[PDB]
Write a protein that binds this ligand. Structure first.
Ligand SMILES: [Ca+2]
Ligand SMILES: [Ca+2]
Ligand SMILES: [Ca+2]
Ligand SMILES: [Ca+2]
Lengths: 95, 94, 94, 95
């Protein structure tokens, strides 16, 4: 299959110029070896962006506390995303 | 195993039975996937308005791409893992 | 003055005229409040699914409170400003 | 007026124990001097939480690039929040 995605990621600012490129080229490499096709890349260099967000969500709210393995969450993950009855879902793990 | 907290929202539209089955259905998945459900809270139907305020500094990278889920999935995985990635987001049009 | 980028979503429900007025109405507010609109993009009606992935470390503080907006507003302001606050979120039920 | 709110904030982990309390007591102080009423506070101490979020939003999407003063954004801010036609709005500034 194939969908058009847009992706943003942030590299911590402590990383050294050469390392940077290595990681960067690395991730594009990661995308490519799997059939993905990169149409364009932008590098904004180091930035400090403040974001404020505001949303309103109405629905039947459910909260779960769970001990699980990585494998488990993806299953939950996967199935939540497809089901039209689930608007939004969120996961916090301790690290 | 890790501790996890999991939040999800159910369409305001859904009915009692459908709802009821759902919670059950999602409950099973976890557990049949070897997870223990420490605790559950049904907060019922809520309209919550929220405001997120955050500041993130670093090297910003943005890609437009054509990919399937696995390529994406994999990527996600490695970003999650990689130490020098603070954050990342992916969005597709349905 | 600062550079700002501003995103907003319009109910899928809204009609052409209502929509049209809206964009206009919000456009005016900024400008009558002395803002210059560098550029505008109408992406039309989109269904975008998104996934945010982030890790935040620090001292976590959580409060349940009864307050009006100004008390909140003020607080927000000072958190935004204070140097040792990485992030903060506020949620109310409508 | 008065509404019930819940608030979360994170203090950077570099801050020193005594400073901590000072800030903390400070912010409660901030809430109180303005009629707010704190019913409960929890301190989880220093934590590293990973969050993954997933939502789906359908609506007419609008993007603006703008040079504005603080004052301006709040006006935008305020009016967006109330209007039932605006589901979600977001603001990025450079800092
Ligand atoms: Ca879904
Ligand atoms: Ca990471
Ligand atoms: Ca701050
Ligand atoms: Ca609104």
């Amino acid at each position: 299959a194939m969908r058009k995605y847009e992706i943003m990621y942030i590299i911590r600012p402590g990383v050294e110029e050469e390392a940077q490129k290595a990681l960067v080229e690395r991730f594009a490499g990661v995308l490519t070896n799997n059939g993905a096709e990169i149409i364009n890349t932008k590098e904004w260099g180091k930035r400090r962006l403040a974001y404020e967000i505001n949303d309103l969500r109405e629905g039947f709210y459910m909260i779960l506390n769970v001990n699980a393995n990585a494998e488990a969450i993806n299953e939950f993950d996967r199935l939540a995303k497809i089901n039209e009855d689930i608007l939004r879902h969120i996961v916090v793990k301790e690290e």
